[PDB]
């Protein structure tokens, strides 16, 4: 299951990962896996990037946000589309999207989330992550 | 948190660290199925915990013994269980609709809708949800 963002900026699980014909129908051309223990199953179909964001109030979101968003821009930039993905996609991988769309466009942490939660409504990103992508304009700390 | 039964409960590792809901919510034990979660109030309440990764590849049934004991003991106890993950979506999810099947001898779209229902954001991964599927089949 899929988030359609942007037609270029889809959110899911390591079940979209894994689902070819779906990859396909919405022209996948890359995937950032932050998972856990998830395969890059179609490495001749697709350009992958992993880099591990585990869901925990103590990992620092933010301090992944120049690798997730040059790739995330690489992909855009060769006009492609871009699946983030995690395990069950609703934290970690929710909170990567809400920056990645808070820093590209110049909107709130509110107006990004809202955009991400419409699009995928099962997402909740955990307190931890809520609080570092709430202060990150502001600069806390 | 959603709550499966009054005395059942599935949330997150923030219902976990929330203190004054647990408390007024009545929880007695709280069954930790996340990884790196901290059992923050060891006096208040009753813990276990158990490893229980979101992959497809993952056994859920093989956890059951463990985990079914611990709901059926808070039950026995007049009690009330919170079971929690992560984010509470995917093996939690999956511990509470097995849990129902078993306890209850609940069909499998039974359970699931009425976990569904308690918390929409519920999605056992793949492999999970083909288990559950033909469990007690």
Same mark, same amino acid.
């Given at each position: 299951?899929?988030?359609?963002?942007?037609?270029?900026?889809?959110?899911?699980?390591?079940?979209?990962?894994?689902?070819?014909?779906?990859?396909?129908?919405?022209?996948?051309?890359?995937?950032?896996?932050?998972?856990?223990?998830?395969?890059?199953?179609?490495? !001749?179909?697709?350009?992958?990037? /992993?880099?591990?964001?585990?869901?925990? #109030?103590?990992?620092?979101?933010? +301090?992944? %946000?120049? @690798?997730?968003?040059?790739?995330?821009?690489?992909?855009?930039?060769?006009?492609?589309?871009?699946?983030?993905?995690?395990?069950?996609?609703?934290?970690?991988?929710?909170?990567?999207?809400?920056?990645?769309?808070?820093?590209?466009?110049?909107? !709130?942490?509110?107006?990004?989330? /809202?955009?991400?939660?419409?699009?995928? #409504?099962?997402?909740?990103?955990? +307190?931890? %992550?809520? @609080?570092?992508?709430?202060?990150?304009?502001?600069?806390?700390?």
């Amino acid at each position: 299951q899929v988030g359609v963002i942007k037609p270029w900026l889809l959110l899911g699980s390591q079940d979209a990962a894994h689902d070819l014909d779906t990859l396909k129908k919405n022209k996948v051309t890359h995937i950032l896996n932050v998972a856990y223990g998830v395969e890059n199953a179609f490495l !001749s179909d697709f350009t992958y990037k /992993s880099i591990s964001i585990l869901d925990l #109030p103590e990992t620092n979101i933010l +301090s992944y %946000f120049p @690798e997730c968003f040059e790739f995330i821009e690489e992909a855009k930039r060769k006009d492609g589309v871009v699946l983030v993905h995690s395990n069950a996609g609703v934290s970690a991988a929710a909170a990567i999207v809400i920056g990645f769309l808070m820093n590209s466009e110049q909107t !709130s942490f509110t107006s990004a989330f /809202s955009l991400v939660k419409n699009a995928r #409504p099962s997402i909740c990103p955990n +307190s931890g %992550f809520m @609080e570092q992508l709430r202060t990150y304009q502001e600069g806390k700390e």
